[PDB]
Design an enzyme around this catalytic site. Structure first.
Site, PDB file in Angstrom:
ATOM      1  N   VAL A  56      21.085   3.756 -32.782  1.00  0.00           N
ATOM      2  CA  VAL A  56      22.422   2.557 -33.100  1.00  0.00           C
ATOM      3  C   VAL A  56      22.340   2.342 -33.956  1.00  0.00           C
ATOM      4  O   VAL A  56      22.871   2.401 -35.477  1.00  0.00           O
ATOM      5  CB  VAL A  56      22.874   2.556 -31.777  1.00  0.00           C
ATOM      6  CG1 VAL A  56      23.819   2.112 -31.629  1.00  0.00           C
ATOM      7  CG2 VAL A  56      23.187   4.073 -30.639  1.00  0.00           C
ATOM      8  N   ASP A  57      21.689   1.401 -34.032  1.00  0.00           N
ATOM      9  CA  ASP A  57      22.199   0.092 -34.392  1.00  0.00           C
ATOM     10  C   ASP A  57      20.095  -0.389 -35.876  1.00  0.00           C
ATOM     11  O   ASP A  57      21.427  -0.799 -36.740  1.00  0.00           O
ATOM     12  CB  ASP A  57      21.290  -0.900 -34.162  1.00  0.00           C
ATOM     13  CG  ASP A  57      21.742  -1.934 -33.420  1.00  0.00           C
ATOM     14  OD1 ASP A  57      22.751  -1.322 -32.923  1.00  0.00           O
ATOM     15  OD2 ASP A  57      21.093  -2.625 -32.723  1.00  0.00           O
ATOM     16  N   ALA A  58      20.033   1.277 -36.901  1.00  0.00           N
ATOM     17  CA  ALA A  58      20.158   1.282 -38.446  1.00  0.00           C
ATOM     18  C   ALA A  58      20.394   0.918 -39.076  1.00  0.00           C
ATOM     19  O   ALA A  58      20.463   0.052 -40.078  1.00  0.00           O
ATOM     20  CB  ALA A  58      18.935   2.672 -38.229  1.00  0.00           C
TER      21      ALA A  58
END
Lengths: 52, 266, 77, 67, 77, 77, 77, 52, 77, 77, 77, 77, 77, 76
Positions: free
Chosen positions: N58-60
């Site tokens: 998600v946070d990439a």
């Protein structure tokens, strides 16, 4: 709006109202309720033994 | 009277500062620069309402009876039971401080907010025409100073309890390991927990401040921008709706203080 | 002067965004309220009580934006 | 482990403690580990996998029912 | 010119966002209303009364945004 | 000249937004309509009545948001 | 310079917004229609009748927008 | 404007709001206090009766 | 002149918005279709027929916007 | 000077977005609260407790934003 | 020179909208596929076949957009 | 001079977006926490632990955004 | 100097929309994967792969925009 | 000059949209995680492993965006 030394003065005004309450309002008011609750509870204990 | 409405609305937003260095009233047209200029009216109605609260409660705390209580006793014991339930729900520690703190917060903020239900021009009319004071607005909660004062009291309380119950070791642990749990992330974790901590009292104070400031500002506008035969139809429904806000903004300040402290200790 | 039109533009954006937020939040909350009413028709007034409680929270910010937008639109101009 | 009962209107088909089970629920296959939150569903006809404590697998044929 | 020009942009954005808000909110609310109806239709008049209670609360702020868009167009010209 | 070539933009934005508001609002509402119908298909004419009851409320604001777009295009511009 | 470009922009916003609205509204309605179909595989005809009925309402105002964007780019400009 | 007319406008709304409160807000509070006094009367009558 | 660039922007918006709407509407519709399929693996051709039926209704307007964007970029610009 | 032109727009952006966020978040959370209440009354007080616990966190960033909006709109300009 | 500058933003917005559309649509579809897979593992390959079948329809309008975005970024750079 | 007014506007956009993100994310999370609580209250403390865990993950970025908003607004001024 | 500034914006918008599309697109997807996981802990090894297999498709376009965004941000300067 | 203010603007846009993306994505993911954990309270640790794994994906892009935003606001 504008910050003011009033923010400091309200801290003085605040704490005292906490201590006067803590000492002279809250415990005396808790007792008033809890003693009546105790009386009603021992009333139930009497009701128990009354038929027992 | 030379009241352009846009300047009538201007006056009403002006506090009555006491310039400490001259120990004198700061006039509305020129605002002196300094941090040493007390807002007199806002602190004044703060301490007056607090005194009224503690007086009316001593009027029962010293006279209460465990019999069939008077109609006046009933109300204060009702509020006592409500508050005590609120506390005993979300908290289980022994510390004596929490419950009276919550009681003071609730009642004091309730009365301050309640101030705003008084017609806007009444006391400002009296205070200058009778007593010659140049400026007056009479809702204490509607100023950042009072709200951030209370919130920065709660902040110190949070720090105090968070040490008293788990000391500097556990506190430095919590400030570093959450959220990511790996020691490598601690340089980041130190910041994020920092903000997530500091935000809480700021968020509290600013919530109360903004809600009440806007509540006041609506009344100012309605009275200053409409004819006599129309002000009621909008002022009435606003006040009816505002009852709920003046209630909730005290209740939530109480509850969030309780939660922040109970979570800091436990 | 170039000072004024910006004020009405800003008030328009404020009240538009506030209208969106408040309307959609109240719609969500009221929809869940109505499904609850369908499940428990005899409780309707209690659920109305809780609904008004929560709607007082929902309308907190949108009414702030309404006032300030109105202040800019008339008290500044 | 948790205790499991497979019972018909006529007779008890299984009892004892189990590690887990896998069931073809009405709305899709399903698997119950200990502590599973309270649940109620119909199940389709077919095998129900058990693994009894100490990992002893077995299949019971169920003609359907309610879980 | 421009003083009398941007006003239309502002009023347009105001009433457009108000329309989005009112439409989406009342859509969600009416959808839940129809769900409740379809589950137990005899209750339709009561649920309709509750729906018409909530609907005004949904429409409260969008309509003041709309009124101010009208004002900006006509009264501010 | 800008005094009219930019009034089109205002009319565009206004009814552009009003379109998505009115579209999705009925889209959501229509969805729950078909869902209820398929569960109790004999009941459609009753539910179809209620769908029209509320559908008029969904489009109330969007319709006037369309009119004022055209009025800007043809009454002022 | 300040005439022609901006009309393409006004049509562009009109039609982009109309496209968002029409697409997503019909998508929602169709999804509900398809689940209805999967639950009552006998009634596809009745559910699709009602689907077209309501879809007729969904896509009205988006087309009111599209046609006017065309008018802009081809009649006016 | 005339500040006179503004205060005359305020008074009307204030009185209307006061009446709304009097007939929609104060009654339920008196009812709650009545109900608590009632409950305590019942509880303590029940207690003395149990002792007897 | 400068004007030769802005039409690129108008096409960019008019087409990107149609991309958003088409992708999302088709996503929702296909999601509900796959759900129905997982429930009724014996019906997938019927469901998939109806799916294409309504998908054609969904992606229509996006194609109008895409065609207009292509026209404005390549033909006008 | 220009500061009192632009900063009102800055405040309007800040507050409109804060309103959107707070209203939508509280709507969702209160909706789940209400559907929890109707499912099981006699828990209304407990779920209301937890609801306020959670609500405290939702409002944080929106309230910071509203505070700064008021600050700029009144302290600075 | 602004033709050398604005036309980067044109492709920027094209690609951004295309990205959001494709990502959201395929996320929704893949989620509805995955939740079926968890429930009906014996259907996995059939559902995945249908999933690619439908996903081929999602990326179409987004792919139109991304191709033109790259065209503008490099061909008429 | 001209710098400051845009630095305020940029802080406004940054913090408004951070606010929408934090608010709606934590609302979506709290909704599931509450509906889990309503079905089995005795697990309330364990669920609250899990919630206060994940809430930091959701809170990660928005607090960076608002920190830098404050930095821009005051430290750089 | 002139030419640099606006391209940092075009770099932003590309990565801004690409971030939202990817993050949400994968959030939706991962959600159903976890729902599947809790229903069938025995299938985690299976669903984990089907998650990735679908995960690759959704974030294809975001990966593209991130690349070209970096390109314009450094190569085109 | 007219230059630096617009760079702050680009950075602010990047980082605000990064906030939106990361917060909403992890909100959805964590909601489904909490309901799954309420369902199977024994397997909380394994589900937490899955949650962190997918949250990393998600946070990439949001983390890339935050890095570039800090760069633009400070390194230039």
């Amino acid at each position: 709006m504008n910050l003011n030394a009033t923010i400091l003065g309200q801290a003085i005004a605040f704490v005292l109202f906490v201590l006067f309450a803590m000492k002279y309002v809250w415990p005396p008011l808790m007792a008033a309720i809890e003693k009546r609750q105790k009386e009603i509870a021992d009333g139930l204990a009497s009701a128990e033994r009354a038929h027992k | 009277e030379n009241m352009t409405p846009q300047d009538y609305i201007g006056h009403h937003l002006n506090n009555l500062q006491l310039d400490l260095r001259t120990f004198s009233l700061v006039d509305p047209q020129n605002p002196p620069a300094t941090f040493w200029t007390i807002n007199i009216d806002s602190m004044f109605f703060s301490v007056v309402l607090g005194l009224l609260f503690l007086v009316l409660f001593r009027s029962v705390a010293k006279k209460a009876t465990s019999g069939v209580p008077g109609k006046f006793q009933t109300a204060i014991e009702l509020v006592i039971g409500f508050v005590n339930g609120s506390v005993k729900d979300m908290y289980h520690g022994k510390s004596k401080l929490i419950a009276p703190l919550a009681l003071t917060i609730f009642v004091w903020v309730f009365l301050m907010n309640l101030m705003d239900l008084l017609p806007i021009d009444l006391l400002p009319y009296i205070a200058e025409h009778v007593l010659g004071l140049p400026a007056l607005r009479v809702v204490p909660s509607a100023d950042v100073n009072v709200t951030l004062s209370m919130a920065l009291g709660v902040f110190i309380l949070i720090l105090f309890y968070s040490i008293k119950m788990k000391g500097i070791g556990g506190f430095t642990k919590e400030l570093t390991l959450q959220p990511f749990n790996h020691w490598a992330f601690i340089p980041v974790n130190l910041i994020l927990e920092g903000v997530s901590l500091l935000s809480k009292p700021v968020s509290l104070g600013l919530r109360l401040f903004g809600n009440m400031y806007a509540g006041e500002l609506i009344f100012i506008l309605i009275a200053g921008l409409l004819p006599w035969w129309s002000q009621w139809i909008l002022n009435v429904p606003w006040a009816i709706f505002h009852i709920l806000i003046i209630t909730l903004q005290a209740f939530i300040f109480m509850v969030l203080t309780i939660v922040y402290l109970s979570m800091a200790s436990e | 002067n170039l000072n004024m039109d910006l004020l009405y533009m800003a008030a328009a954006v404020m009240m538009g965004l506030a209208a969106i937020g408040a309307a959609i939040g109240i719609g969500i909350l009221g929809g869940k309220f109505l499904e609850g009413a369908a499940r428990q028709p005899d409780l309707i007034p209690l659920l109305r009580t809780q609904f008004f409680i929560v709607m007082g929270l929902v309308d907190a910010i949108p009414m702030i934006a309404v006032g300030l937008g109105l202040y800019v639109m008339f008290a500044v101009a | 482990t948790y205790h499991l009962d497979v019972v018909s209107a006529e007779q008890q088909m299984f009892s004892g403690l189990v590690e887990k089970i896998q069931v073809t629920g009405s709305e899709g296959e399903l698997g119950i580990y200990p502590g599973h939150a309270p649940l109620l569903t119909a199940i389709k006809p077919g095998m129900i996998r058990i693994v009894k404590q100490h990992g002893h697998e077995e299949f019971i044929y169920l003609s359907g029912g309610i879980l």
